[PDB]
Design a protein around this ligand. Structure first.
Ligand SMILES: Cc1cc2nc3c(=O)[nH]c(=O)nc-3n(C[C@H](O)[C@H](O)[C@H](O)COP(=O)(O)OP(=O)(O)OC[C@H]3O[C@@H](n4cnc5c(N)ncnc54)[C@H](O)[C@@H]3O)c2cc1C
Ligand SMILES: Cc1cc2nc3c(=O)[nH]c(=O)nc-3n(C[C@H](O)[C@H](O)[C@H](O)COP(=O)(O)OP(=O)(O)OC[C@H]3O[C@@H](n4cnc5c(N)ncnc54)[C@H](O)[C@@H]3O)c2cc1C
Lengths: 461, 461
């Protein structure tokens, strides 16, 4: 039984960040990883997604070329070219991560970990045993897929994982789900030329975002050529002579249900949710608590219910973002190895960017959330809607919407929501301001930067 | 003698902003304007510049098209197309401004104003007299040009004003000056296909910016195809059979001076400075103080040395930006018509964006300024330099540099300097944070947004 100061199960963002900070603090750490280092962010998430986004963004700007005084750009996007370059880049990252571990003197244990029956928390990887007074579970999650029992032929569809394996641009694609990943994939496939439908169970996407965003985002998708199938769901999928045929039920409220066949579908993409990767960990051998989806339950300090066992990142099922897993992993290393007992991640005011077209940036409370927290009488919002100056000369148009949610007399800024060109790079600093507890006067007292879209936020009235 | 509560001389950004806020407060105001409303920002500055920038930005992205999986884009930018669209847009703005004045019940007095000999401060416009207990001078400035006495043939060159009149893309262009306007024009002309030289008196451009920025900016220009002629200056200009011929002296220190002829120049653009527009105001009739460049001297509250006469904006020669003229004009209306005696603009921590390629964003103290203000022992900087993920797949590359200047033990953030893709939209919110007196811990305690360039600022170590 090899003993370490810190054993980290999962070599993704949370696991790596935590292991690296712990090593800086003197800890003797090892990381167990059964697949590729970098985990979701590098391999099938953040990185490859952003590259595909930058590519879709090229496609849209090329629509405006002639408007800008250039000669029309003629054609066919070549999927394999960018795919090959994207894979390469991912390979460059994997090698860098490996090198980061080595320079930090972190041991990499390759294989699939599982807890043992052993009294003192001990894991087994490939027949060998490992132990530590502090063990971090950071095994992330996976895409959720429907059961053949509920939706026959569901297994003919792919997930976001499968999207990163595609070698050609699917001719006809149907995306099922209304969350960010659904929205992002539909946007990329559509911009790149796939005839795309997005199938959602209600009337809008991103229903958990501020209502100005879910509304605007649904509209922008339609404006961009994405067919949004509202109140629809898949009843069954079948392999036809040439593609898939999707049977769906559309049940608009106040209407009779109608069944529709979607034929000649090349790509059926399920973007319905993520499941935690805890199933094969043998958690029960230690009686580690999970919820009924398989998520590991932790406290504010990432503790599980068992002493010396912690969990961070997607496995915990809260705020499923790469920077969150990193920050929580880091704070945990300081608490464990630097004895900072108050060391923990504040889960409020975490900013998010959704890489739609145009991108979405959000931080803090939606209007309804502030209304429930402070009372209608105590919530004041300011918002603007305009066409960015970039489109002053284009036939194609997109809008920019911004909303600021203030609370109490002081008008504390408790939420910022926006969609528009440049919103992906604009959010960070306002997120800093919101974290510091800025009020509307703080924004109003900052001189604007002209001409930009960002200046709208400091001149709201 | 028609009497008003407030008379504003100059219908540009500062003048309009001040008149409009005053009118909201009940004041009976009139604006005197001798040319087009909107002044510099609308007509020959901010707006038309940004449109040309967006156009140059198209040109650069089109270089990356093939890298991104698309077929090569072939050609010739057509200047007149964009020029015509740009002029139109400017016409749309002028009509909007006019409408804004009318809806506010502000009277527009068309013509050229000048002070009278009259005891109580009185102006004359087209033979009629006007007076008010509060008169605002907001006449802006103009491009500076060399005297034929010092540089013979200087009048064969144009200024930024003339740039907005060009109808064709000049084949060969030489820009003289090292400030932002010089930098911006060289960048647009070069991106659009003009064979461009930038002639500077020293070794770097933007010498008043943080040294990381002047260095990086000079390099990016060279990398983009701009020829930077260092330690050079124009000795004379002459009209040859086909274009202009520019005689310049190059005097590198530690070297002998060398004289060079630049032939076949289509466009010679002077971007050497701005002069205040005060010359024809008859200031001396009231004994209003000016400096030796013709700038109106004011105090912290925009007062001149004469009671009931104020000045804001470019005419004052400090922080020559559209948002500054607006903010100072607005603060002044609140002080005069809302009786807020402490109402004034804080000239510290004003953010600036330079629309180069890539754009530059800056706020607060440069490293040298903080060193002089707090002492070397009390200044700590953090900086990063990386290649944005956008170029992971391109042959063409640009860099992103960021520098944070902290002061004292607390590490108060006293300056932020950056150059890079997305930096134009990224600055605003950090400017809010810096204005509120954030420290490095405030930044460090804000969760990052991944994957973005902006997140680099919250993860500096
Ligand atoms: C398509 C997509 C796009 C996304 N885009 C973004 C984005 O733009 N921005 C953002 O912030 N977030 C984004 N996310 C979410 C973000 O990627 C995740 O929140 C983050 O990667 C979770 O990190 P983690 O460390 O919890 O898990 P992971 O990075 O998944 O790490 C888990 C690791 O543990 C390994 N493992 C699992 N079980 C075991 C075991 N028993 N033994 C050994 N090793 C094991 C797995 O192989 C894996 O490498 C995206 C996600 C997806 C799917
Ligand atoms: C090429 C260029 C690009 C720029 N780009 C930017 C940018 O991107 N961002 C930014 O923030 N700033 C930028 N600036 C600077 C910004 O435009 C100026 O600081 C701002 O316009 C100054 O405003 P003002 O109100 O002082 O003057 P102006 O807008 O110049 O207003 C002065 C007005 O007074 C009128 N006038 C003058 N004398 C009289 C008189 N005697 N009687 C009647 N009317 C009179 C003039 O016609 C004019 O309309 C740029 C400037 C230039 C030249």
């Amino acid at each position: 039984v090899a003993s370490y100061d810190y054993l980290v199960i999962g070599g993704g963002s949370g696991g790596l960040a935590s292991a690296r900070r712990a090593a800086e603090l003197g800890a003797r750490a090892a990381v167990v990883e059964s697949h590729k280092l970098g985990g979701t962010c590098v391999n099938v998430g953040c990185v490859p997604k952003k590259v595909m986004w930058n590519t879709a963004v090229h496609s849209e700007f090329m629509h405006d070329h002639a408007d800008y005084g250039f000669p029309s750009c003629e054609g066919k996007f070549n999927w394999r070219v960018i795919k090959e370059k994207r894979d390469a880049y991912v390979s460059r990252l994997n090698a860098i991560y490996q090198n980061n571990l080595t320079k930090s003197h972190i041991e990499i244990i390759r294989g699939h970990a599982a807890f043992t029956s052993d009294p003192k928390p001990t894991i087994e990887v490939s027949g060998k045993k490992y132990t530590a007074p502090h063990i971090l579970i950071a095994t992330g999650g996976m895409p959720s897929t429907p059961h053949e029992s509920q939706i026959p032929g569901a297994s003919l569809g792919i997930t976001s994982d499968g999207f990163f394996q595609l070698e050609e641009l699917p001719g006809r694609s149907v995306i099922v789900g209304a969350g960010y990943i659904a929205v992002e994939m539909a946007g990329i496939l559509s911009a790149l030329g796939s005839k795309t439908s997005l199938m959602i169970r209600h009337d809008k996407v991103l229903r958990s975002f501020d209502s100005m965003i879910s509304t605007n985002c649904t509209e922008e998708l339609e404006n961009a050529g994405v067919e949004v199938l509202k109140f629809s769901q898949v009843k069954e999928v079948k392999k036809t002579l040439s593609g898939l045929e999707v049977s769906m039920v559309t049940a608009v409220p106040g209407r009779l249900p109608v069944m529709t066949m979607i034929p000649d579908v090349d790509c059926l993409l399920w973007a319905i949710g993520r499941v935690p990767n805890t199933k094969d960990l043998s958690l029960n051998k230690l009686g580690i608590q999970t919820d009924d989806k398989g998520h590991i339950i932790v406290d504010e300090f990432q503790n599980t219910n068992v002493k010396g066992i912690y969990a961070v990142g997607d496995v915990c099922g809260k705020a499923l973002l790469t920077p969150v897993a990193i920050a929580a992993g880091r704070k945990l290393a300081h608490r464990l190895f630097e004895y900072k007992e108050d060391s923990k991640l504040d889960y409020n005011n975490i900013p998010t960017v959704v890489f739609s077209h145009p991108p979405i940036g959000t931080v803090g409370l939606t209007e309804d959330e502030a209304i429930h927290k402070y009372g209608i009488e105590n919530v004041k919002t300011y918002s603007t809607s305009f066409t960015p100056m970039y489109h002053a000369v284009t036939k194609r148009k997109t809008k920019c919407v911004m909303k600021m949610v203030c609370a109490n007399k002081e008008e504390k800024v408790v939420g910022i929501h926006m969609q528009g060109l440049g919103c992906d790079e604009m959010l960070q600093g306002f997120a800093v301001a919101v974290k510091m507890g800025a009020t509307k006067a703080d924004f109003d007292n900052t001189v604007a930067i002209h001409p930009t879209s960002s200046e709208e936020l400091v001149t709201l009235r």
